[PDB]
Amino acid sequence: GTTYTIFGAGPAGLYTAWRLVTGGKAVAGDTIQLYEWGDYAFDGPGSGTRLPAGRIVTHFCNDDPKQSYIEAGGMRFIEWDGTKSQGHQLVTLTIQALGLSGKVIDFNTTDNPLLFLREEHIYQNDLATHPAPYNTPGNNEQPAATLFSNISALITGDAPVSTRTQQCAFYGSGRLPSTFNSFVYPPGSIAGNIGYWNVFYDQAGNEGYEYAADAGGYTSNVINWNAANAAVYNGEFAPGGAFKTVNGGYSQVFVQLYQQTLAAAQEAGVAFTLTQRTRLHSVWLEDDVVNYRLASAENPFKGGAVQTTQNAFLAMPPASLDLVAEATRYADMPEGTLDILNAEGVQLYMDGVIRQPSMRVMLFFDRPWWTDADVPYPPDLTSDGAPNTFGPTITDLPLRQVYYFGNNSDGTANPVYGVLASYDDMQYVQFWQELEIDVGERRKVPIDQDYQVLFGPRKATDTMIRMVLLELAKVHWGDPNAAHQIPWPVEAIFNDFSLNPFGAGYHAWAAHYDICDVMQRIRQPTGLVPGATAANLFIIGEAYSNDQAWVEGAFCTAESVLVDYYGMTTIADTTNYPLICAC
Amino acid sequence: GTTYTIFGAGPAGLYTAWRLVTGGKAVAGDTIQLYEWGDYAFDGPGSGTRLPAGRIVTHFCNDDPKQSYIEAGGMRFIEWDGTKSQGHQLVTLTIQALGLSGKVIDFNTTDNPLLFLREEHIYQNDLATHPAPYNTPGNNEQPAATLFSNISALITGDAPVSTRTQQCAFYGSGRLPSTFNSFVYPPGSIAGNIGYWNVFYDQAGNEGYEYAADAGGYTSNVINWNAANAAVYNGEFAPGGAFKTVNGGYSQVFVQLYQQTLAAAQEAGVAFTLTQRTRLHSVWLEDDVVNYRLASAENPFKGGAVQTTQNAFLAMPPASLDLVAEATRYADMPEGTLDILNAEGVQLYMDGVIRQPSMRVMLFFDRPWWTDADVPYPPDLTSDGAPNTFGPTITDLPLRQVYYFGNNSDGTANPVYGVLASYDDMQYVQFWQELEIDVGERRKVPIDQDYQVLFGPRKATDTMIRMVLLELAKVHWGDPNAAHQIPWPVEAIFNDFSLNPFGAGYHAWAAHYDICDVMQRIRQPTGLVPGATAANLFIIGEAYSNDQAWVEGAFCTAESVLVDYYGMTTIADTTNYPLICAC
């Protein structure tokens, strides 16, 4: 039979194993071996240290599956709309296939977020009469979205940028229009060779950029990423659609991928196993044969016996690839081998994304204190439309965004009310990291060896809780001393995605890359080594996808490999929806 | 005889060799072997790719030693005052011993810097007339220095913090006063377990922090480093003294260390060799015996045969130590060895500093355009503190500070006029890095393999030059369209210190560390490993010193090792000058 070896039981790896079995590529007698460094709870309460999988982690208050929860990783999806060809098609199809469509609910955001900017409190609808305190004439009386759309249109000009295919084409062929007005960037410049922040800064000045970075929505990415992709993903014609979540958490999707793959494997006679607490240590090729070593979670740097497979999936992000590549980079490898991850073209293409650090603080309260009548600046979570919403509130602080989940349980547990506090960006990673150790304690774990998110959300220190409460007091009262009015959380925990093995909350395409060429060619890295024998060793996950903010991109890269390198029939309608960009 | 093996011919490694020979520790029949990854010009024109050494690099315009220059790395020092016992003692003694004291000149800074903040132009002397555009009442009418001094006093209370000894003791034992007024931090908290930015932000709010970060002097430092050390180094009572530089460049210190060591070694019968384009690849211990491999610069990841020495100095910063540790971390090491750099206590103490990325753009103009009579906001380089000065101009832009060196040429007929543009901090690294590749081109070198500073200042792209001129136009004209008024530079080059092998402009002691214990014990890392045989393997350099901004710290740690582990008589008077903190 045929053995399929998957390293990483995150979304991409789990989706791959589920498609191989349910799509009927793995037949009776075949083997699927999934290896996961972490110890996720696939088999109910007590079967792991946190719910699955990777950067998706639903966290229930007190670890009570009947309680309110906060998504401590990825939190929402965009429902596929086939009449518009927009939304997370594989996520929507997979939820339906797993029998979970009945649990899909709206994730509603306020039309009138509170903005806390340079010590001013401005509800977004009021900007026409209370201009934002940024020296950016015109733009400061409009939501930041108006400035995003304006900058996008200065970059895209008259180019069609409405469909997914047109957007893909702009990544490679998009040029600044003949009308581009700049001292720095000539008209006709290749937009994919421009940094988004660099050109936003050129066109709107530091105050226009800072206003957009401080007051913009969650989904508009202002880091210095590929300007071609940034323009089409932040503009008027950016992909959109209805935001949804899975009632009871996103993690159940990954529990069901695993359990349904195992039930289908039993019916098909396929040997499907998950081996947790076990990492890929090193990988290399001998012609088409993938050689690899495993390491235990207890001793992650020491490899075991050399194993072989004809089919290997590296279902793991850049920082995780880096740790595997480090294990052979400096080694004296066997004669006739190819140290594939350290080949020059593979290392170059792996740098086709930049990294954004993220930290999430999850706080449960015994009452929804933010709704009290005497709160000076409450979040506007009701009407402004009709349904109830989760916020956010948006600020120029380290605590850059707040979501208010409240009691999102089925109502049978003792009511707790959840708040998600978001810290992001290179600017702030060093700010938040020192809050992770108690003020009475020295650091004990070397930072690059603290695999905190891999194990599960970590108890918030008293310093971290107090800092969050200070920032929420400034947001909702305008007085740091009001932190005394906020009740102490009944539970507070954090996920710091900058730590290994994740090394990032998010990846974004880099400037000075041909995005489509990286998306196409990085998946089978032997293609980036001139003269190499093809091998079925693949790189999959959201990082080198066309949907980097989303589980969708993990599923799409995995699907693209099954289609292109295993000849499988896709479950998607790709007519108007390329899984990854073509060049 | 006795062999001394030094890895890294930066300031620390060169100083070590010089002291070993000129102090008479190495005697006739001994050997000193220095290995350097780079290829520095120690022997005049044609002898390397840039002037020595490490993060000190004088850059002459057009590679003309008679032209104006700009320090493309470290630029100034504090002259030792033995009467007050204040300043950079070893740097001053070394310049004197090398015969370079007659090249020492004042490095003067304006007492009335131009501030460009949130699109407003304010000369610092006029903040009473035109308050800084930050919502920080009182603080915004005073120089940022006042706020720095106020915060330091809130942290230090009545603790004496004027002497090196007392500053060292504050790192380990210093506590917030009983009067500390904070929601986040209790009175009496250990200041060394607090992040400086965390507590600044707590006490002064985001607008007070942002004003200090944007408008503070060059030496001011708001990163989230150890609050005990930050309070005593940012306070009214920070280490002071008269700022100087070496006319003709700081690099000639390092040329002269090498040449004079070689001459002295030849007179003494010591074999002194510098082998460049050759790096330490891997290091480990067998009892007291230092085992190592070298790699060529051409093939930096492939080690040669195992070599041994009894005396080894790792004269290289954290990111450089990290690359050497990576080469054994994942290896199956020989029987009876100690993989010293990957020992738990060594890895923990190596994380006792955080890193600050820095980028320097050096621009030479054919005329001092900033002095022209029609310039709306010229720098006040002439009068206010009596003699002429180099600036700076201070801004809230990515281009955070400007220095104006002008014509410092020594005998050209066609002098040029130099400008130093500084970009720093984790916030901006991704902003400046995309300017490093031409707008017509894709990236070609993997970012972690682009050893740019090692080679030498790189030609600025046209996009980088235009960005700097745009920022200088906004600063000096308040009109981005005035960029057309600035003459195109004769030469523009950059040094990005975030790149390997440096991985930082600067290191700063971290929160949640006992600074003194790390300073003392990291130097001989076998002392951090229970059961290990002691070995003469040392870690030296600025990063784990008590003078992290400065060459002084490289010399002090190197001096401390020669005194503590080789029984050498110090050249310093340590009466009021501990080389490193004592515990």
Ligand SMILES: Cc1cc2nc3c(=O)[nH]c(=O)nc-3n(C[C@H](O)[C@H](O)[C@H](O)COP(=O)(O)OP(=O)(O)OC[C@H]3O[C@@H](n4cnc5c(N)ncnc54)[C@H](O)[C@@H]3O)c2cc1C
């Ligand atoms: C703060 C945050 C918010 C998000 N919000 C959303 C959202 O609202 N909706 C959404 O759809 N997406 C969201 N995402 C993105 C989503 O989390 C990712 O797209 C998705 O988790 C990517 O899946 P992946 O399988 O590619 O990688 P990962 O989730 O990173 O999984 C990789 C797996 O590989 C394992 N691994 C690593 N190294 C090894 C090794 N050597 N051997 C074996 N196993 C290894 C890891 O432990 C992990 O389990 C968010 C992400 C973050 C961080």
Ligand SMILES: Cc1cc2nc3c(=O)[nH]c(=O)nc-3n(C[C@H](O)[C@H](O)[C@H](O)COP(=O)(O)OP(=O)(O)OC[C@H]3O[C@@H](n4cnc5c(N)ncnc54)[C@H](O)[C@@H]3O)c2cc1C
């Ligand atoms: C922007 C900037 C401004 C500064 N301003 C000042 C200032 O005004 N005044 C001042 O006094 N100081 C200043 N400094 C600091 C000064 O540059 C440093 O303190 C000093 O260079 C540190 O010397 P070092 O020997 O510890 O390390 P480095 O200068 O980093 O030298 C280490 C050496 O080790 C080599 N190396 C690395 N890995 C290996 C390997 N595996 N094998 C062999 N060799 C290896 C490197 O190539 C390098 O030559 C500044 C620094 C920067 C970046």
Ligand SMILES: N[C@@H](CCCC[NH3+])C(=O)O
């Ligand atoms: N995926 C993140 C942010 C959205 C980014 C979209 N560009 C979340 O919804 O939690």
Ligand SMILES: N[C@@H](CCCC[NH3+])C(=O)O
């Ligand atoms: N080395 C700097 C001092 C500050 C460095 C730390 N950011 C100088 O030239 O004065």
